[PDB]
Amino acid sequence: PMKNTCKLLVVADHRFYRYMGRGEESTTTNYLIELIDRVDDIYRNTAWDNAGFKGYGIQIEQIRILKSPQEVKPGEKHYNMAKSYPNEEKDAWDVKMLLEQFSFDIAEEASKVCLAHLFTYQDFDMGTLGLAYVGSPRANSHGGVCPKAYYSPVGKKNIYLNSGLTSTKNYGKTILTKEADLVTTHELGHNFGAEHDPDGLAECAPNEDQGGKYVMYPIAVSGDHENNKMFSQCSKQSIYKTIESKAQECFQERS
Ligand SMILES: CC(C)C[C@H](CC(=O)NO)C(=O)N[C@H](C(=O)N[C@@H](C)C(=O)NCCN)C(C)(C)C
Ligand SMILES: [Zn+2]
Prior knowledge:
CATH class: Alpha Beta
CATH architecture: 3-Layer(aba) Sandwich
Keywords: Cell membrane, Cleavage on pair of basic residues, Disulfide bond, Glycoprotein, Hydrolase, Membrane, Metal-binding, Metalloprotease, Notch signaling pathway, Phosphoprotein, Protease, SH3-binding, Signal, Transmembrane, Transmembrane helix, Zinc, Zymogen
Distance between the termini: 14 Å
Binding site for Zn(2+): 186, 190, 196
Number of helices: 6
Subunit structure: Interacts with MAD2L1, MAPK14 and MUC1. Interacts with iRhom1/RHBDF1 and iRhom2/RHBDF2. Interacts with FRMD8 via its interaction with iRhom1/RHBDF1 and iRhom2/RHBDF2. Interacts with TSPAN8.
Bound molecules: the ligand CC(C)C[C@H](CC(=O)NO)C(=O)N[C@H](C(=O)N[C@@H](C)C(=O)NCCN)C(C)(C)C, zinc ion
PDB class: hydrolase
Number of strands: 9
Shape: globular
GO molecular function, one term: metallopeptidase activity
Helix content: 25-40%
CATH superfamily: Collagenase (Catalytic Domain)
């Protein structure tokens, strides 16, 4: 019961620093402190087993604010580089490659925490807001909560897929504060072991009259409905199993 907190590495790239933090370290830091805290309220108050398996959440261990782009040599790349990859003409990276790059460059630091999350400000194609590796109760699981090394031929080092990312820009504008909270909650949800909520008899995708959809629905919920900020029964079952298996592994006490 004491090891109930997933310690985070939170990173804000130069884009987030500039457009969301107004180029100020204080504003950027406070934004991300407050957002993670709001997301934590959702997590801590969720009873994963619909009883007393409550009190599990997230807490920032380290915050890194990248104030300027990462100077890069020819043919070389970095998640914090000024240009988007692989298509320099696009407003955004390709989201999958960005998450992959982030994990590679931040490997050393990620091995020290339960999860690493990247906050950026770029307009991913076709309406995408965030992405994350799915966690699992499986011992040899490679993804989600807890740093489970994955050798990387090319970097002579271990890489950890205990990561996810959130962008606060979509369709040419800054998304709402309540929407940003839902994106991170959703991505961290995957890291905690949840898959997407399915439609049908499973009770995991209610109609508007029944409170609306839950946070792990694949199509971004608005946040206007009661169930939008909460986890469905389908997510609870998946996450419950993951937490009970990995909590002793890398979770720590709340600070
Ligand atoms: C926080 C959200 C739920 C994350 C997912 C991506 C995901 O599953 N990451 O774990 C997303 O970006 N969903 C997009 C999404 O629902 N975006 C909305 C804003 C959208 O474009 N709706 C369509 C408007 N005509 C997709 C990829 C489905 C377009
Ligand atoms: Zn998702």
